[PDB]
Structures are given as C-alpha cells and as structure tokens.
Amino acid sequence: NSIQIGGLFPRGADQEYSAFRVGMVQFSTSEFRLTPHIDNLEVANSFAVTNAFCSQFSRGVYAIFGFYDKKSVNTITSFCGTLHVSFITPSFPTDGTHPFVIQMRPDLKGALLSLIEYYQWDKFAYLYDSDRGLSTLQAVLDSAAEKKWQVTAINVGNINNDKKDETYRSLFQDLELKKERRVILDCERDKVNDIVDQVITIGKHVKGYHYIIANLGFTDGDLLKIQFGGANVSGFQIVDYDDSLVSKFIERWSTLEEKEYPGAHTATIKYTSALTYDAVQVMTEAFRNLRKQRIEISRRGNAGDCLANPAVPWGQGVEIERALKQVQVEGLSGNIKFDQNGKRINYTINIMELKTNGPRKIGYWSEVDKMVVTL
Amino acid sequence: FPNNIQIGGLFPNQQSQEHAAFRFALSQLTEPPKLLPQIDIVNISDSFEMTYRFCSQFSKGVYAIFGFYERRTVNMLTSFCGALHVCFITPSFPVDTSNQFVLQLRPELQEALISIIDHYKWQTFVYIYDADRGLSVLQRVLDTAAEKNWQVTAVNILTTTEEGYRMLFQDLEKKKERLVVVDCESERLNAILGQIVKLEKNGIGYHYILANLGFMDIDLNKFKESGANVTGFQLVNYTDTIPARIMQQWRTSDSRDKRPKYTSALTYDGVKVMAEAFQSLRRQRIDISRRGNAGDCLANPAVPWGQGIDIQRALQQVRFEGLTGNVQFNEKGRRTNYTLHVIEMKHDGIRKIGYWNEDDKFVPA
Numbered sequence A: 001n002s003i004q005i006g007g008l009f010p011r012g013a014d015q016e017y018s019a020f021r022v023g024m025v026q027f028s029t030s031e032f033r034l035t036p037h038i039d040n041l042e043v044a045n046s047f048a049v050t051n052a053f054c055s056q057f058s059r060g061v062y063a064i065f066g067f068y069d070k071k072s073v074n075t076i077t078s079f080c081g082t083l084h085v086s087f088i089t090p091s092f093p094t095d096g097t098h099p100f101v102i103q104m105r106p107d108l109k110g111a112l113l114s115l116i117e118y119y120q121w122d123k124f125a126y127l128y129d130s131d132r133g134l135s136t137l138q139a140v141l142d143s144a145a146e147k148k149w150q151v152t153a154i155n156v157g158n159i160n161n162d163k164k165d166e167t168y169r170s171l172f173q174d175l176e177l178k179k180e181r182r183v184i185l186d187c188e189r190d191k192v193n194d195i196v197d198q199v200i201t202i203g204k205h206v207k208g209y210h211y212i213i214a215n216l217g218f219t220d221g222d223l224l225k226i227q228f229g230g231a232n233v234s235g236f237q238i239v240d241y242d243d244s245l246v247s248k249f250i251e252r253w254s255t256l257e258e259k260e261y262p263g264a265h266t267a268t269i270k271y272t273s274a275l276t277y278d279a280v281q282v283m284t285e286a287f288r289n290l291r292k293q294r295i296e297i298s299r300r301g302n303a304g305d306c307l308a309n310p311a312v313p314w315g316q317g318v319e320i321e322r323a324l325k326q327v328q329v330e331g332l333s334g335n336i337k338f339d340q341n342g343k344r345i346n347y348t349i350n351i352m353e354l355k356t357n358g359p360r361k362i363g364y365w366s367e368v369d370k371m372v373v374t375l
Numbered sequence B: 001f002p003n004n005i006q007i008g009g010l011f012p013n014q015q016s017q018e019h020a021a022f023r024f025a026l027s028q029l030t031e032p033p034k035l036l037p038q039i040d041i042v043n044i045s046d047s048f049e050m051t052y053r054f055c056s057q058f059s060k061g062v063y064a065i066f067g068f069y070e071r072r073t074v075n076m077l078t079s080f081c082g083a084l085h086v087c088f089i090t091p092s093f094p095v096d097t098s099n100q101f102v103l104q105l106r107p108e109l110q111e112a113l114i115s116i117i118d119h120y121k122w123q124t125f126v127y128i129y130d131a132d133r134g135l136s137v138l139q140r141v142l143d144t145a146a147e148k149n150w151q152v153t154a155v156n157i158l159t160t161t162e163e164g165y166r167m168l169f170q171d172l173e174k175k176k177e178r179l180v181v182v183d184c185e186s187e188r189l190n191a192i193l194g195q196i197v198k199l200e201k202n203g204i205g206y207h208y209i210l211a212n213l214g215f216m217d218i219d220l221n222k223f224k225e226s227g228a229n230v231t232g233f234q235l236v237n238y239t240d241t242i243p244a245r246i247m248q249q250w251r252t253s254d255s256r257d258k259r260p261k262y263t264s265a266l267t268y269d270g271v272k273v274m275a276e277a278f279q280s281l282r283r284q285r286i287d288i289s290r291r292g293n294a295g296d297c298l299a300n301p302a303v304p305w306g307q308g309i310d311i312q313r314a315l316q317q318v319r320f321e322g323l324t325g326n327v328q329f330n331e332k333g334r335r336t337n338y339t340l341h342v343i344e345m346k347h348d349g350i351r352k353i354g355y356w357n358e359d360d361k362f363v364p365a
C-alpha cells in the first residue's frame, strides 16, 4: 500500500538524500512502501519553501519530510498548523511547542550545562553561530546569572570567507588578554573546521587549552589535527558506533557505490543522515500502525491550494500526527520516543573526549537521570 | 501617470492610533496621484495569514506595500520582497540582514545606546531584552562588552516570570551600584514599569535606561516622585515649527471630528515618504504601468516586475524634513543621517542632555 510522501532537501546536502534512499530500500516491503516526491532548494529562502510546500500540498502529500533554517521555521510551522500537515525534521528543534511538527533532533542544553559543571567552569568564552536560533545561548546566560559565571559570547556567523583570516586572529588576540583558556564552539561542522584550522595556526591547541564542541556530531569533523597538540577536546555524539544496528548499517554503508551513494563509502555517518534514516523508519512504523489499526486516511479529491480563504484543513491529519508521535523504536541514534509536542524524549547523548589514540567515550547523559560517568 | 495608483496596507488592529494616523495623513495628500489605502487587517505573528494577504495584494496589482512585521514573520516577508521586486515600507523594528526593497522608517538605537553607556562610567550592569527582535541589539552589546570590558547580566522578559524578576532584583541590590538597561516594545515597557514600581524602584543608586525611540509617550509619573534616575531617547520634537504645525493641524482636525506614539509618528511619516516618491516619479515622467496578469505569487518561476526596481530607487532617493526628523535612506534601505535626543527625567526635570548623530558621537548640548 503506497502512501504519498514529500521530501525537501537543502541545496548541497548529498549524504542525507543518500541515507534517505538507503532507508527506503531497507524498510521497503512488498506489503508497504513510500512514494516520495523530492524537491531541492535553498531552505533559507522562505519564498522557495512556500512554493515547494504549496506544490507538494497540491500533490496531496500526507506528510512532508524536510529541513529548515532560522529564516524558514515560522513559515513552515505556520503552514503545518493551519493545514494540519505534518513535518518531520532532523533540523534544530523549535523554541516552542509548535504542533504538527515532529523533531528528530534531541535538545542539547541539558548535556552542555551538565558538562560545564563536570569541569567546574567559571570563566569561559562562548563562540556561537547565528543559526539554529540563540536558545542555547540564552540558556547559558541564564545559568550564568544563577551561578555567577563569566561568559564572553562572540558571534562568528557574520564573517566573510574572503576576509576570514584576519578576524579570527584578532578575536583570539582579544580573548588572550583575559586568559581565556576555555571555549565552547557552538557551530556546525563546517565552521568548527574553519575555526580549528585557525587555532592550530596560532598554536592555541596546547596543554593549557580546553575546547567543548557543542554539537551532536563530534567525529564528523576533522579531529586528527588536534589529537596530538595536547589540548582537551570534549563533545557529544548520539550515534554510538559500538552498537549492533549501527555496525550492521556501517557494513551496508561502507560497501556502497559512491557513484550512486555520495558520502556513503566513508566509515563515518553524520547525525543528520542518521536521523533521516531513522525518520524513514518512523514514518513507516506510524503508517503501518495506522494500517493495522484500520484508521481511515485517504484524500478523496484534491487539496485545492495552500492559500485558500478560508483555510479548510482535512481532518484526518490529527490521526497521522498522533500515529507519528506514538511510535517507540530503536535506530541509529538510539531510542526514539516523542511527546505530545513533538520533541524527543528518553534518549541518551553519549559524551566523548579526544585522546592520542582517538575519541573515547567517558559517559552519557539522559534527561531523567543525570550526567552519568562510566570511564 | 494614472491617479489610480493602488497601494496596500497590512495592519493588526482596525482601530488604533497608527491606523488613524495613516488614514489621516492621506487627507493632506494634494498631489496629482491618488494613493489608495486598501487596508487588510491581518495578525502579524501568523506567517501563513500574512502570506495569504501579501499574495492577495499581489493579485490586486498593488505597486507598493506599507505595514508592520514581527520577529516570527520578518524573514518570510523580507524574502517575498526580494523575490518579486516589490517594496515594503515599515515602521517596525529594523533588522541587520535584509533586502534593499524593505524601507525601515525606524532608525536603529543600537549605536546610540552604546555611546550613552560609554559616556557614563558604567562598569557592570543588567540588560533586559524583549525577544521581539531585540536580539540584534544584544549581540552588539555582547560584542562591545569584550572589546571594552564591562560586565553585562542579560535577562529575558519574554521567558521571565514574577519570581524571575524577584530573584534578579534581589541578587542585583546586593551590589552597591545598580545600573539597568530596558529594551522593550511600546506596550511591554509599561508592564515592566509597573513591575518595577511594586518594589526595587526606590531610587537608591538605581539608574535605568530606556531603549525606546519615544520617551515622552511613556507614563513615567510614578518615577517623578520616588527619586530615581532614568535616561531615554526621543526622536520626535513637538516644539519645532514643522512638527508644531503638523500636530496643531492634525489635532484640531481630529477634535473637530494627546500626543501620538513614536510608532504612529513613523506611520504618518511613511505616507509622506510614499507620496514624495510618487510625486517625484510623476514629475520625472517615468513609465509606470501595471500588467493585468496579476500572476499568482506562487508562480514557478516568478518573473520580477520590471518597473518595480526603479520604484525602489525612487523610494530610496526621496528626502525631506518630516515630522520625526530629516528622512533619508542608505543603500541598504535604512534611515541614515538622523538625530536623536538624549533625555534624562529627574524627579522634577526633563533635561535634554544632548543629541546623537550618525557623524558625531553623543555631542552634548
């Protein structure tokens, strides 16, 4: 039983679509499947997002997988709320309780603020990118007010690539006057690399310094540069490579034709792709649960247009949203459970350090228990 | 050019000072062109409702748009304005990243606030910021805090409760000197003032700053007795000749049918901006014509309107001494070369300490 599906993918994201296709083949079955209609665009152009979302809505899509950026959150969430159309994302979780939006990415503030307390930090810088909102920045500042921390928050997201070299050096020159030996690099993979490649040049990767990479993908970057400098490097990873499902997936991943699955050959997998794969699993589980439960989901006719006065949402969307939120399965990221709001719960965020041998896990973190330490 | 130059309008409330000022200012329009208000009442926060209204105005063929936007829907709107090459006038909060088709009739206070804080020997202080687009001004401060080495304890009002204020002020008064900045909206400032009047507003070394472009509108009567310092900014001078005449005529007409808020003043000025641009376009004899195609905003691909570019340039070129100040526009599409009035309110005193200018840096007077 084919169920129509929609897919949005940011321009220049090759690995994620490949993981989407791999998840399709893995979870596809004779009795059930998915028919995805794909669109590629610049997710930071709300106009393009609106056009794609409306086109897919006209194409009678029951749910829409996709990504979004800080300049397209509100458009997407409003459209989903008005049209009662679901949305499944591995992108940053909303700073709210927006409905009809399932979020596959776990929050990070809890683990970050626990880790900063497992190290007894009082005076640290906080380099942040102007993306995925400033929710974690605000959390850090608030906990500073409570705990009398000394935070130097600096933005690096408005730096021109052409003149990148001059600014970073002056930034660290400023930080040196305060003896800022501790830093939190709250940025995506690319800018973390572009910064680590300028800590090295100025020799600030040495015994004295400590870096915390506030990202759910720690290995994703290039850490072979700083393994040996002598400086600490801490971070978080949801994809545990010492697991069974993960190892089997890697067996299927490395043995992949990069001519067909770009990014697939490498042994590493980025958390966005992992969450995309788990998202395919989520959709299949929810839709198959609907089929078993006999819930009636079918578009008898045509959804005229996204823009229609008055807006007339089709009333089976609540069923789809409830099914998507009411699914409990294991996957690459770990255990996937949702709330009535869509945010994930009952998840474990493994913590990692950098050692000359390589990254090694030292503990984990769960919302219920605490920061937990094993090694 | 045709006198049926239809203009749009996006407003949140049918009856308000801003809407009334926009309606009134059109009466003074004696130019050959006739601008239609074509108001649509739309909720600002909801991006979907707004996209519906904006595409409806596209269907009508509207040449230019005036209205408001909030944090949630700034990006959406901005994006449509840079794609269809359609201009959008606004008095709402200005933004750092924007197209050239969005004319923001609200000069940014971030630069002047830095200067005022610099002048006073401010070593450490508390910052209070509303999430309603205030974040752009936060970063600046946090960026200047590092360069110039003062401490800033930010607290958000949107996600702060009464207990939050209580704890913040209790921890604050443990310090000998108490300095506070309050960036807020027009209406949030009144509620926060009420919150501080209850307690912690005694005036014992308390120095508040109000990052609001209009400081006369706010009812600081409760602050004229407790003996507390407050500094603020003003953009509109009622005494000057042009403001005096405009206020006299407008208030006389309205009564024949109070002081406007800064938002209403900017709303009134925007009418003058649009009228000046269209008058200069008719004078310059520029070929403006609206095709009746009225293509759906969601047209793939959406061809830019050919004339819409020149309109922008015209709207950018205009310049005149309006009510608030001298109206001008930068290349990015933002107010340039303006003046602000620094104003301290003593127990019994409204003192114009000085004025801030783009070329100068808080030259006293």
Ligand SMILES: *[C@@H]1O[C@H](CO)[C@@H](O[C@@H]2O[C@H](CO)[C@@H](O[C@@H]3O[C@H](CO)[C@@H](O)[C@H](O)[C@@H]3O)[C@H](O)[C@H]2NC(C)=O)[C@H](O)[C@H]1NC(C)=O
Residues within 6 Å of the ligand: A078, A081, A097, A098, B043, B044, B045, B046
């Ligand atoms: C303009 O935008 C939207 C829709 O027009 C409005 O935001 C919506 O406001 C309603 C009522 O406050 C919210 O419903 C309530 O939400 C709270 C959570 O905030 C929940 O606890 C309640 O049970 C109830 O569901 C709704 O969630 C909210 N939606 C969004 C997307 O924010 C806004 O108030 C409108 N403004 C005006 C002036 O009409």
Ligand SMILES: *[C@@H]1O[C@H](CO)[C@@H](O[C@@H]2O[C@H](CO)[C@@H](O)[C@H](O)[C@H]2NC(C)=O)[C@H](O)[C@H]1NC(C)=O
Residues within 6 Å of the ligand: A181, A182, A207, A208, A209, A210, A231, A232
């Ligand atoms: C880099 O990592 C090492 C190992 O974790 C840190 O060294 C420890 O720090 C404690 C903190 O007081 C000191 O007593 C010892 O030097 C080490 N003890 C233990 C149990 O590891 C080092 O401090 C880290 N660098 C920074 C800048 O935090």
Ligand SMILES: *[C@@H]1O[C@H](CO)[C@@H](O[C@@H]2O[C@H](CO)[C@@H](O)[C@H](O)[C@H]2NC(C)=O)[C@H](O)[C@H]1NC(C)=O
Residues within 6 Å of the ligand: B326, B337, B338
């Ligand atoms: C910046 O604004 C000031 C307004 O105070 C402009 O000064 C006026 O400029 C016009 C145009 O040359 C003159 O006709 C007026 O006599 C000037 N008045 C005053 C009080 O200076 C100034 O020209 C503007 N700067 C630029 C570059 O446009």
Ligand SMILES: *[C@@H]1O[C@H](CO)[C@@H](O)[C@H](O)[C@H]1NC(C)=O
Residues within 6 Å of the ligand: A335, A346, A347, A366, A368
């Ligand atoms: C929820 O978390 C537990 C650990 O707290 C783990 O066994 C698994 O992820 C989930 N188990 C449940 C929900 O029983």
Ligand SMILES: *[C@@H]1O[C@H](CO)[C@@H](O)[C@H](O)[C@H]1NC(C)=O
Residues within 6 Å of the ligand: B205, B206, B207, B229, B346
């Ligand atoms: C408050 O105002 C007084 C003048 O009334 C002046 O000393 C200074 O501006 C402020 N002094 C404080 C807050 O101690």
Ligand SMILES: *[C@@H]1O[C@H](CO)[C@@H](O)[C@H](O)[C@H]1NC(C)=O
Residues within 6 Å of the ligand: B234, B237, B238, B239, B240, B241, B341, B352
């Ligand atoms: C307003 O302008 C008059 C002269 O035009 C001046 O005397 C007065 O100080 C101004 N008011 C403010 C608040 O700048």
